[PDB]
Tab-separated table of C-alpha atoms and ligand atoms in Angstrom:
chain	number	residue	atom	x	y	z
T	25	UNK	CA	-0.118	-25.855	-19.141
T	26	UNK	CA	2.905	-26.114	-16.794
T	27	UNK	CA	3.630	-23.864	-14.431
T	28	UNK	CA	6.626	-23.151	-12.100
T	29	UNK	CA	6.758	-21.755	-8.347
T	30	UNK	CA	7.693	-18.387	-8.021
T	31	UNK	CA	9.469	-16.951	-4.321
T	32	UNK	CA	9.967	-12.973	-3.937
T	33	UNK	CA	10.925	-12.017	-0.664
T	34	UNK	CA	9.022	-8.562	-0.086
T	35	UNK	CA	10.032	-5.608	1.673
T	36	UNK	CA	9.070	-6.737	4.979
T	37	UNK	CA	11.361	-9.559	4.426
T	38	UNK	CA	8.039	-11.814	3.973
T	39	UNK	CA	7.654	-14.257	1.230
T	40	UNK	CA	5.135	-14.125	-1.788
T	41	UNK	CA	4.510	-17.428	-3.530
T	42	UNK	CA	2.591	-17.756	-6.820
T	43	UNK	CA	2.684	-20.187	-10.144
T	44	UNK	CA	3.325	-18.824	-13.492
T	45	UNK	CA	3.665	-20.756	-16.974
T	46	UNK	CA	6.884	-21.719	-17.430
T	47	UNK	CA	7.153	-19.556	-20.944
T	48	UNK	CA	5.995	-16.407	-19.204
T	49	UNK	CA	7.719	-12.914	-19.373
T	50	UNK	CA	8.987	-11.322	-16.340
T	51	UNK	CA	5.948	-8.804	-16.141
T	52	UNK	CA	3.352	-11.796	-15.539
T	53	UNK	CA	5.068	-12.123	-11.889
T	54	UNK	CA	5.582	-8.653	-11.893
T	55	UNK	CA	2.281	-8.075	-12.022
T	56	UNK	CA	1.024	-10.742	-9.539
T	57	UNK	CA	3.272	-9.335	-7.205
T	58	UNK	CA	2.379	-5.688	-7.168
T	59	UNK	CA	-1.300	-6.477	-7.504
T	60	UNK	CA	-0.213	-8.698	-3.640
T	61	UNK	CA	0.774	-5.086	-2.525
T	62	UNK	CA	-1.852	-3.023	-3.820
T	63	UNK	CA	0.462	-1.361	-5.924
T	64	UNK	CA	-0.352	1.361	-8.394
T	65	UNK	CA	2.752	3.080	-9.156
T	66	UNK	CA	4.649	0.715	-10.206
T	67	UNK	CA	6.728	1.806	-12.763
T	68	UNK	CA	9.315	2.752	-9.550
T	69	UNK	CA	9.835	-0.840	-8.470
T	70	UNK	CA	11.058	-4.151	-10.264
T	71	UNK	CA	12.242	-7.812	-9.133
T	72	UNK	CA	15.590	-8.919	-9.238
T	73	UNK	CA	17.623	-12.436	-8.776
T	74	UNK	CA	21.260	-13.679	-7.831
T	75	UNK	CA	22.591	-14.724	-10.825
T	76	UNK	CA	25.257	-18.100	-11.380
T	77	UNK	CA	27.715	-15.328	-10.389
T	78	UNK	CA	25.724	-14.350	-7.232
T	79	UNK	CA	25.225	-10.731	-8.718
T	80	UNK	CA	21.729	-9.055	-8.404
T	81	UNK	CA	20.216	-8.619	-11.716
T	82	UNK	CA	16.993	-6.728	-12.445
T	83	UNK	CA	14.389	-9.366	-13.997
T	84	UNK	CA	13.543	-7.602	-17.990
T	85	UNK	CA	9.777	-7.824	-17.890
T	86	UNK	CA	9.951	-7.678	-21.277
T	87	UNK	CA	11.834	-11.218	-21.320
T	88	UNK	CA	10.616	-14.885	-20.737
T	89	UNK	CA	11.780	-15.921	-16.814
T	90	UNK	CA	13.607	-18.937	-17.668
T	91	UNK	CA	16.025	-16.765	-19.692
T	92	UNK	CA	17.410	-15.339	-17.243
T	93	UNK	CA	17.337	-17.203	-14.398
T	94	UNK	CA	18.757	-19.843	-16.419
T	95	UNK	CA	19.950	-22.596	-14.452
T	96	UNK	CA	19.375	-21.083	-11.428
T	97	UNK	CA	16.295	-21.244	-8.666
T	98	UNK	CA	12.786	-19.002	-9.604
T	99	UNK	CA	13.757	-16.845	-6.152
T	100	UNK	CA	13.661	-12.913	-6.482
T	101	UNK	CA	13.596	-9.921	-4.534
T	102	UNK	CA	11.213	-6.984	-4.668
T	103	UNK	CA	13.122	-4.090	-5.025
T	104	UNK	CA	12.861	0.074	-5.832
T	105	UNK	CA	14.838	0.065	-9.292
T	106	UNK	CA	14.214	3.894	-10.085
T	107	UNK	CA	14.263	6.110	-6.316
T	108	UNK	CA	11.982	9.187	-7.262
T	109	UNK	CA	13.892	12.531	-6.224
T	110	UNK	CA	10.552	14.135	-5.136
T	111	UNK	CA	9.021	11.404	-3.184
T	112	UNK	CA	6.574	14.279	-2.573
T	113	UNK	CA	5.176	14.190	-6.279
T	114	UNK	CA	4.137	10.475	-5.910
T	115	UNK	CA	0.188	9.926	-6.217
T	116	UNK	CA	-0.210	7.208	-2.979
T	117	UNK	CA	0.961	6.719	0.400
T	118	UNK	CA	1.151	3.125	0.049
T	119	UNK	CA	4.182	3.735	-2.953
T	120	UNK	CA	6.120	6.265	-0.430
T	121	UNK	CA	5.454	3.254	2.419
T	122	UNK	CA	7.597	0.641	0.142
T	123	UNK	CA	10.016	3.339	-0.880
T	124	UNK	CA	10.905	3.890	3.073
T	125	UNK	CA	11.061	-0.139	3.704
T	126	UNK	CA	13.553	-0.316	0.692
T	127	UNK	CA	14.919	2.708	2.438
T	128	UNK	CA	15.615	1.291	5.821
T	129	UNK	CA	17.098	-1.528	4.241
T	130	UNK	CA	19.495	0.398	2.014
T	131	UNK	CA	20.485	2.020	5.395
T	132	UNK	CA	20.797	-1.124	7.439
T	133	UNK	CA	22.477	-2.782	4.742
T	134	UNK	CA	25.132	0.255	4.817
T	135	UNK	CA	24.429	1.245	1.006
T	136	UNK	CA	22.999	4.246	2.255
T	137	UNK	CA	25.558	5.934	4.643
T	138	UNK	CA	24.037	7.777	6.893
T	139	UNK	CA	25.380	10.709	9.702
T	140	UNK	CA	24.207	9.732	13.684
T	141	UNK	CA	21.452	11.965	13.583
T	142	UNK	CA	20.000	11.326	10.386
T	143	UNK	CA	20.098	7.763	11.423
T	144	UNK	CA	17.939	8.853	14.401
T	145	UNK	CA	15.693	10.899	12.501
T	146	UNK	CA	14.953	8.257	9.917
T	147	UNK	CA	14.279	5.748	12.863
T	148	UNK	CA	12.225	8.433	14.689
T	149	UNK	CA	9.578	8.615	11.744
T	150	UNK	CA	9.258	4.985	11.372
T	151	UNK	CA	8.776	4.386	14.970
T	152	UNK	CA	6.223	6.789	14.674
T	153	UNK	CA	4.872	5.670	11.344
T	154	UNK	CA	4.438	2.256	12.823
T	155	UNK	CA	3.500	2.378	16.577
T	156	UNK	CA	2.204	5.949	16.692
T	157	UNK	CA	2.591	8.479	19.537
T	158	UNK	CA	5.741	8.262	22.014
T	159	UNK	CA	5.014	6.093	25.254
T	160	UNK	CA	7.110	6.453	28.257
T	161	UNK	CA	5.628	2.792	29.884
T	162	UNK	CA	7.272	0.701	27.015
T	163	UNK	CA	10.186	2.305	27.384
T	164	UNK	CA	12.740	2.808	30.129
T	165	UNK	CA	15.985	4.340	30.653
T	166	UNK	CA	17.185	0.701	29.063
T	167	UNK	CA	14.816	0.753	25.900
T	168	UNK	CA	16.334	-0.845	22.690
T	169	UNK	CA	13.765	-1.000	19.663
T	170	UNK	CA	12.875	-4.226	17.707
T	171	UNK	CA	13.507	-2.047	14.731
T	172	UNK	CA	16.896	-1.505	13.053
T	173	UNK	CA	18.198	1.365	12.443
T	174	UNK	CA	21.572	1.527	11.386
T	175	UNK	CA	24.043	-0.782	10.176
T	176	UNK	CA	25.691	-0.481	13.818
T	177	UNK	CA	22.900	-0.146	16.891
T	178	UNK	CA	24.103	1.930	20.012
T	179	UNK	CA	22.552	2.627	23.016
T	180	UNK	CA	23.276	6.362	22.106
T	181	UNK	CA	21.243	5.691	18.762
T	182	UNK	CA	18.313	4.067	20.400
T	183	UNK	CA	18.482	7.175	23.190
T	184	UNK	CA	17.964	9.525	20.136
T	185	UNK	CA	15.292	7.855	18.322
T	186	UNK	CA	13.382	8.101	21.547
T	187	UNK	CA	14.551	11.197	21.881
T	188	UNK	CA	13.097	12.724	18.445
T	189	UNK	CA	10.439	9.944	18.735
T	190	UNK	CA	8.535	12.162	21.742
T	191	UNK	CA	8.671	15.304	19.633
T	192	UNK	CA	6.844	13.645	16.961
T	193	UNK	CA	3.131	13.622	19.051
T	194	UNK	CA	0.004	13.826	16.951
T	195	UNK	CA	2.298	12.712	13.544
T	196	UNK	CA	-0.118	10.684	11.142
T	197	UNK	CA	1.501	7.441	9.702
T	198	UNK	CA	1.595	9.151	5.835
T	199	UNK	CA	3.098	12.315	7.392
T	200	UNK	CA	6.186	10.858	9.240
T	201	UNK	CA	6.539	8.461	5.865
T	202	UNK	CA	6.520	11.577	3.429
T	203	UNK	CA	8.756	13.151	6.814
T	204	UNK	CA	11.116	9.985	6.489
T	205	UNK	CA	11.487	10.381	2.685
T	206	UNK	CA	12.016	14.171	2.866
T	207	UNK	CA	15.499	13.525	4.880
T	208	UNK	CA	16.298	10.450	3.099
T	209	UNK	CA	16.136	11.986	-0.714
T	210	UNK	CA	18.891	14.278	0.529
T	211	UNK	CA	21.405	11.936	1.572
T	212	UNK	CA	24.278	11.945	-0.939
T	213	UNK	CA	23.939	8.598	-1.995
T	214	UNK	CA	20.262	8.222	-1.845
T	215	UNK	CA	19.174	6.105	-4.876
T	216	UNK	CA	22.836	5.482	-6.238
T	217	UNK	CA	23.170	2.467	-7.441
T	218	UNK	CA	27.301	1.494	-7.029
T	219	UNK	CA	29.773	-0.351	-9.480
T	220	UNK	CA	33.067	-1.187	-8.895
T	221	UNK	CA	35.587	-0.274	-12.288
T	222	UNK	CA	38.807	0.995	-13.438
T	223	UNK	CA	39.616	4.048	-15.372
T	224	UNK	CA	41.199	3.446	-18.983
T	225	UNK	CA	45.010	4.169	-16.512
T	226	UNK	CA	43.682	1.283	-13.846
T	227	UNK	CA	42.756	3.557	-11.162
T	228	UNK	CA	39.976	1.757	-9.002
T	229	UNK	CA	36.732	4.006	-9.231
T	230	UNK	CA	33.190	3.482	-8.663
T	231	UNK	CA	30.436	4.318	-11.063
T	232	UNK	CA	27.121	5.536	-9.094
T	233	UNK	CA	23.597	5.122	-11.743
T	234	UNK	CA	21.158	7.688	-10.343
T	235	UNK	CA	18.540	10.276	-11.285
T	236	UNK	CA	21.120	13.178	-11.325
T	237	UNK	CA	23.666	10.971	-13.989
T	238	UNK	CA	26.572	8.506	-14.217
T	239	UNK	CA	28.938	9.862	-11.196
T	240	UNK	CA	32.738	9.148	-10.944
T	241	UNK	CA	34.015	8.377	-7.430
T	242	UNK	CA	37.958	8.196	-6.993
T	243	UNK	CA	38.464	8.839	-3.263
T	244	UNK	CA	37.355	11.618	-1.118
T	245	UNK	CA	38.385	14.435	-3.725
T	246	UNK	CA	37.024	14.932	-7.123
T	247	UNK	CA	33.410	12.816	-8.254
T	248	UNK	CA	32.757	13.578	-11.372
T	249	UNK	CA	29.469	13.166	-13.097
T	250	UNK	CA	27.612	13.170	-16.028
T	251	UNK	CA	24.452	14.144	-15.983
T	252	UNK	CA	22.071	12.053	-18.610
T	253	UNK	CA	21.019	14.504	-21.182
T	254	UNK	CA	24.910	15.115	-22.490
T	255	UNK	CA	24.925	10.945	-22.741
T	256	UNK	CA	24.093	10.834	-26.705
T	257	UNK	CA	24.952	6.813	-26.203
T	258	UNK	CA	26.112	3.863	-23.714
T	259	UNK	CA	27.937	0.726	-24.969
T	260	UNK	CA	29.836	-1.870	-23.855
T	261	UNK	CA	32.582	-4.306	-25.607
T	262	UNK	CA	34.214	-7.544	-24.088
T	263	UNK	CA	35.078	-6.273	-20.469
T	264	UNK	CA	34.673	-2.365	-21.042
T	265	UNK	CA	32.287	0.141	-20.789
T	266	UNK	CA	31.728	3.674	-22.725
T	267	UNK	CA	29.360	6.363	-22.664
T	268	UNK	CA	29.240	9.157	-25.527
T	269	UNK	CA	28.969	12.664	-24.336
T	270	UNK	CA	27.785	15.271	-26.643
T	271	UNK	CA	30.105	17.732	-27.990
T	272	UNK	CA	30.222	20.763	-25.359
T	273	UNK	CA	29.560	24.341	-27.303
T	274	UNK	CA	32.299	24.925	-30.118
T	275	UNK	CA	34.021	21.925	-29.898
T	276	UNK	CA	34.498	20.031	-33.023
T	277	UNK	CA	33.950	16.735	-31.427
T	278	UNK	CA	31.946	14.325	-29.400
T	279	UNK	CA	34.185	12.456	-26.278
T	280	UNK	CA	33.839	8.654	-25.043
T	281	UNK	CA	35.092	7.597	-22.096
T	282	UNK	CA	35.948	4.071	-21.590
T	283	UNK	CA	36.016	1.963	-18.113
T	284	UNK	CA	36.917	-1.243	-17.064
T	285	UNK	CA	34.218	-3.808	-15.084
T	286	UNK	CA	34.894	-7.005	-13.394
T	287	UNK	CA	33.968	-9.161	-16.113
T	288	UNK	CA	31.707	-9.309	-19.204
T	289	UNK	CA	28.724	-9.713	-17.183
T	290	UNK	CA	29.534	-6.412	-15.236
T	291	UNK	CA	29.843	-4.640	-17.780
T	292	UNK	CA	26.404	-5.786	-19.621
T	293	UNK	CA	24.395	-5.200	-16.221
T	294	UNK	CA	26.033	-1.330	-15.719
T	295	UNK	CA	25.227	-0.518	-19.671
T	296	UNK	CA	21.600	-1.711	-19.247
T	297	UNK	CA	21.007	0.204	-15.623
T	298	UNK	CA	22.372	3.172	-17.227
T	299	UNK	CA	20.095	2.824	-20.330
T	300	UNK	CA	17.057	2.458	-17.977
T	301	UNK	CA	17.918	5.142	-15.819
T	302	UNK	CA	18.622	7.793	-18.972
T	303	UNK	CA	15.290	6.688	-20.430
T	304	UNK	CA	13.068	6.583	-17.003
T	305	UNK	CA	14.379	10.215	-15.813
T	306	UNK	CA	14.435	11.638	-19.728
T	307	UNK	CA	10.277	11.031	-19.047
T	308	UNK	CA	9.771	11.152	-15.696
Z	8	WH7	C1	15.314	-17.093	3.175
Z	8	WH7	C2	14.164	-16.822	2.197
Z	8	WH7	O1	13.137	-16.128	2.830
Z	8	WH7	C3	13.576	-18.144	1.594
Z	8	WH7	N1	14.487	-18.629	0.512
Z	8	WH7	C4	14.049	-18.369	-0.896
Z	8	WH7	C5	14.900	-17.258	-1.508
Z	8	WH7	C6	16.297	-17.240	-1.448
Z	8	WH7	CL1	17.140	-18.524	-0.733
Z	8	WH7	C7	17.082	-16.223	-1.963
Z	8	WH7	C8	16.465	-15.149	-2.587
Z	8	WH7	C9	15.079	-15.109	-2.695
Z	8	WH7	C10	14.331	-16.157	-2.164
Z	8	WH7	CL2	12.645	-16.066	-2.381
Z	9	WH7	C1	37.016	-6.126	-2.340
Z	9	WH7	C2	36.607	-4.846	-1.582
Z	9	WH7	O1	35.324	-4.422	-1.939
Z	9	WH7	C3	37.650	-3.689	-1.821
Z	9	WH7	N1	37.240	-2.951	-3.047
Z	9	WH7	C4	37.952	-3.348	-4.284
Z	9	WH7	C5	37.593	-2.410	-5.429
Z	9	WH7	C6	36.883	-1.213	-5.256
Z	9	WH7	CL1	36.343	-0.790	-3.687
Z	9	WH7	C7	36.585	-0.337	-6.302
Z	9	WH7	C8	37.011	-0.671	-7.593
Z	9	WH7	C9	37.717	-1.857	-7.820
Z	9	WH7	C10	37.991	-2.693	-6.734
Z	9	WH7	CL2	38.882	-4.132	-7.018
């Protein structure tokens, strides 16, 4: 029975290594993987891959590996696919501890913009999360942190941290997690996952797939969104993508609105995100 190597690069940025049959569906490694973290929930979390485009794709557990990694290596990422609004209301510790490493990676990456002192805050929890109680002898007027923060690291940043690090004495490693996640959730792009499109005039937008809906940014003035009960149907044709809304009370008539991807391929990964996300937070 033949088996090929599997990579995933975790969310310490360690790498998990396993064999699966060749023929095997996505969940197989799935599986393997999440049982390596001693994770329960995992209905949260996925694996994804860069495709011959170099575009993240969430692995289909439901499909064999080799068709969809194609041509390319057997080297994925663990990832959150569906960020819970109420962190709160997950059963184990251990899920919110993955949620805040994908977390600090969304904010060091910059996906997650973040003010100056939420950036602190966050940092403060982990630090205390992670090393425990503030220590003055580690730490001098000249202290910068192993641990990133922030997509930029200043000395003012690292100051605060340290700051709002000491006022977190006697803080178990669970409680500053759940305290991390309790800032993070509200951060207006927490979760959102971003395409770039055009509107059916050729206005640039982006399309943000989260809990709340499909939102509609434009610039700095009007985002739209649509939450995902009123989506009766999503769709996509050639380089285009449409949702159906539901007809709003009294009107005659349904609506679709059209948008414009990148390619073919962009348009087939935003339809099946959005599908996933209306069915996930329709039972969640
Ligand atoms: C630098 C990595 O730790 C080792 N390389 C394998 C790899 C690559 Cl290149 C890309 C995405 C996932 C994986 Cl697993
Ligand atoms: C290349 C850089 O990311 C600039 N952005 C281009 C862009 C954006 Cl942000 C949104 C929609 C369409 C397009 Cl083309």
């Amino acid at each position: 029975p033949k088996s090929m190597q599997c990579k995933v690069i975790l969310l310490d940025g360690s790498e998990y290594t396993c064999d699966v049959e060749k023929r095997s569906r996505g969940q197989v490694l799935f599986d393997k993987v999440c049982e390596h973290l001693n994770l329960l929930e995992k209905d949260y979390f996925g694996l994804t891959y860069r495709d011959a485009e170099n575009q993240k794709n969430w692995l289909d557990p439901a499909k064999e590996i080799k068709k969809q990694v194609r041509s390319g290596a057997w080297h994925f990422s663990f990832n959150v696919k569906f960020y819970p609004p109420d962190p709160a209301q997950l059963s184990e510790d251990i899920t919110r501890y993955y949620l805040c490493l994908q977390l600090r990676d969304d904010i060091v990456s910059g996906r997650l913009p973040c003010s100056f002192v939420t950036l602190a805050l966050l940092g403060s929890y982990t630090v205390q999360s992670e090393l425990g109680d503030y220590d003055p002898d580690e730490c001098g007027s000249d202290y910068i942190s192993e641990f990133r923060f922030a997509p930029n690291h200043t000395k003012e940043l690292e100051d605060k941290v340290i700051e709002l690090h000491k006022s977190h004495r006697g803080m178990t490693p669970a409680e500053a997690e759940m305290h991390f996640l309790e800032n993070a959730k509200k951060l207006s792009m927490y979760g959102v996952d971003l395409h770039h499109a055009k509107d059916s005039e050729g206005v640039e937008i982006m399309l943000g797939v989260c809990a709340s809906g499909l939102l509609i940014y434009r610039d700095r003035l009007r985002i739209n969104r649509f939450a995902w009960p009123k989506v009766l149907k999503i769709s996509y044709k050639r380089n285009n993508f449409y949702i159906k809304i539901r007809p709003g009370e009294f009107e005659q008539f349904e609506s679709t609105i059209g948008f414009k991807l990148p390619n073919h391929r962009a348009a087939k990964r935003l339809w099946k995100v959005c599908v996933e996300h209306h069915t996930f937070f329709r039972l969640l």
